[PDB]
Every structure is written in structure tokens, then in C-alpha cells.
Design a protein around this ligand. Structure first.
Ligand SMILES: NS(=O)(=O)c1ccc2ncsc2c1
Length: 182
């Protein structure tokens, strides 16, 4: 309906797939080549399903910062026969706050779902299901089950992936350009 949903849609239509692990279905964001991200609580193994295709996991890394604290991002390299459109130029380089964010989800249940979550705060520390976690973004939408992996964008930037909620707020792990240098 506006430039926010326009950018969100462009990212969803080319750079997402439906990942399925032993812990169910997830919005998975493809970043470049065969490299994608998913919440660490997805518990990626040796094998994953991508758009309902048995796919070997060539590598999987659950990111932590240099304080040895969880970031709740798992970077996955997929044994896929096709490369993602490279979107690393849409990743912010620094931790920051944002206005007018959209949280975008695509599953079998929730296809083509776009939520205007509004103002985003650099929240920082969060105790996420008992795990100390850093670089958390917070927004004031009562998000729900099946929205995890959801992509958070602003007009111009892909800023994080949805990793949880407390019924009043939602929380995203930051995506930083430095995570995907090669
Ligand atoms: N993205 S936008 O805000 O410029 C916009 C608004 C209304 C509209 N109606 C049809 S196409 C279209 C685009």
C-alpha cells in the first residue's frame, strides 16, 4: 500500500524460502550465493527442507558476539542448485533504531503476510527463553507463533529476523553487513 510494503514485497518475492527443521516451518531469508539465516532455536541439523525439498546443510553457524553471548542468528550454507539474489548492500553496517518497519512472513499457513510494526528500538540485552541474547530490536506489535524468521525491513534496509515476543512486543536479531563478509 506504500513504499514500506513495496520494499518488503521485493525482498519476500526473491530472497525468502520456507525452511522446515525438527522444530517446524520458518521464514528463511537468503542473503547471497547459497547462504541464508534462520533463528538459532530452529535447531538446524545435517538435513533441512527448503520449499519442500530435502536439502543437505553444507555448513551451519549459530552466531555469538565476542562477549560469547548468543545472537539467535544461525547462518546456513545450503546444498542448493541455485544462488540467492545478493542483498548484502541492503544490510545496515551498525546497530541502530528505525522508524516505519514492516515484518514480512511467508509460510504454508501465513502466505504473503505483511505487518506494519512501526517504530523499532535498539533494545540490546534480552533474556530470550532463558538465554542471555545481545543486539535485540523491539517493536510494539503483539506478534504470534509461525512469524519466527519473519523478515524486518525499512524502506531501503533489511535490519533483522523475528526471533520472539511476550504477547505485547516482538523481538528481532539484528542483521549486520559484517556477518556476511567473505
Ligand atoms: N508505493 S506508493 O505509496 O507509491 C503507492 C500508493 C498507491 C498505489 N496505488 C496503486 S500503485 C500505488 C503505489
Amino acid at each position: 500500500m506504500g513504499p514500506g510494503f513495496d520494499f518488503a514485497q521485493a525482498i519476500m518475492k526473491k530472497n525468502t524460502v520456507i525452511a522446515r527443521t525438527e522444530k517446524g516451518e520458518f521464514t528463511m531469508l537468503g542473503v547471497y550465493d547459497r547462504v541464508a539465516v534462520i533463528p538459532t532455536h530452529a535447531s538446524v541439523g545435517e538435513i533441512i527442507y527448503i520449499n519442500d525439498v530435502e536439502t543437505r546443510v553444507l555448513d551451519a553457524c549459530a552466531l555469538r558476539d565476542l562477549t560469547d553471548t548468543n545472537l539467535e542468528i544461525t547462518i546456513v550454507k545450503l546444498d542448493r542448485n541455485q544462488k540467492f539474489r545478493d542483498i548484502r548492500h541492503f544490510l545496515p553496517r551498525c546497530e541502530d533504531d528505525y522508524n516505519d518497519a514492516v515484518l514480512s512472513v511467508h509460510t504454508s499457513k501465513f502466505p504473503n503476510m505483511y505487518i506494519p510494526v512501526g517504530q523499532v528500538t535498539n533494545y540490546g540485552f534480552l533474556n530470550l527463553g532463558g538465554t542471555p541474547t545481545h543486539r535485540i530490536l523491539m517493536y510494539n506489535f503483539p506478534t504470534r507463533a509461525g512469524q519466527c524468521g519473519g523478515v524486518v525491513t525499512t524502506t531501503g534496509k533489511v535490519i533483522g529476523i523475528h526471533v520472539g515476543g511476550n504477547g505485547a512486543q516482538g523481538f528481532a536479531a539484528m542483521l549486520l553487513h559484517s556477518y556476511f563478509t567473505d
